[PDB]
């Protein structure tokens, strides 16, 4: 059950100014405006993105207190026949996503940003948003979608214990045996873990970790 006053909704244009402010406060990577425009494009990051809203009293319009911006991608953790596989991280492209097999039928949901203002923490709100995303992925095929989302993943800065703990508590695992070097352009250190959770028809693979990569 959500705490009184909270709601979770698909991310919409009216939420972007506030979510951008929240990200600016809580995430030490400055995103360009294009990042937020793409978050409104169902073909870019405008399908699985969610706003976390709060109303102090029933007289107040709900306000954005957090959110997840997400992007659909080809799945880089599975073979084209569904086996778990070590990730491929081309050495000349560390700032790029792990490389998925060509023409895979499987998808991943990539969490580009996750943030929640501190007064609203420890209430299960971000976990509820994640569960809403997972449930959306589960019902999309029955709605006629060609999306087959088998994994959710993110990059987590190696200094961000708050984030690492959340992802671990939500059932994600560190993949590849080491963080990605040179992932961030300006942050020091520039390293980020790839964390991933297999879901849906692949949920039974969630505990199959590869402690190396290609």
């Amino acid at each position: 059950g959500l705490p009184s006053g909270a709601s979770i909704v698909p991310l919409a244009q009216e939420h972007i100014p506030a979510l951008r402010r929240i990200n600016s406060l809580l995430l030490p990577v400055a995103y360009p405006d294009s990042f937020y425009h793409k978050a409104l494009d169902p073909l870019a990051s405008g399908l699985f993105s969610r706003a976390i809203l709060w109303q102090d009293t029933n007289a107040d319009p709900p306000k954005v207190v957090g959110g997840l911006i997400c992007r659909l991608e080809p799945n880089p953790f599975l073979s084209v026949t569904g086996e778990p596989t070590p990730v491929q991280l081309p050495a000349d492209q560390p700032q790029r996503a792990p490389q998925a097999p060509k023409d895979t039928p499987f998808h991943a949901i990539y969490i580009q940003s996750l943030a929640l203002l501190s007064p609203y923490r420890s209430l299960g709100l971000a976990a509820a948003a994640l569960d809403h995303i997972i449930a959306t992925a589960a019902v999309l095929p029955a709605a006629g979608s060609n999306i087959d989302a088998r994994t959710i993943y993110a990059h987590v800065w190696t200094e961000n214990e708050e984030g690492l703990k959340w992802y671990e508590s939500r059932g994600f695992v560190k993949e590849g045996g080491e963080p990605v070097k040179g992932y961030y352009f300006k942050l020091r250190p520039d390293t980020a873990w790839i964390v991933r959770r297999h879901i849906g028809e692949s949920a039974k693979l969630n505990d199959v970790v590869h402690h190396h990569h290609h």
């Binding site: 360009p32 700032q95 996750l114 993110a154 980020a192």
Partner: peptide, 5 residues
Amino acid sequence: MVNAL
């Protein structure tokens, strides 16, 4: 947190 690429 994705990078700014």
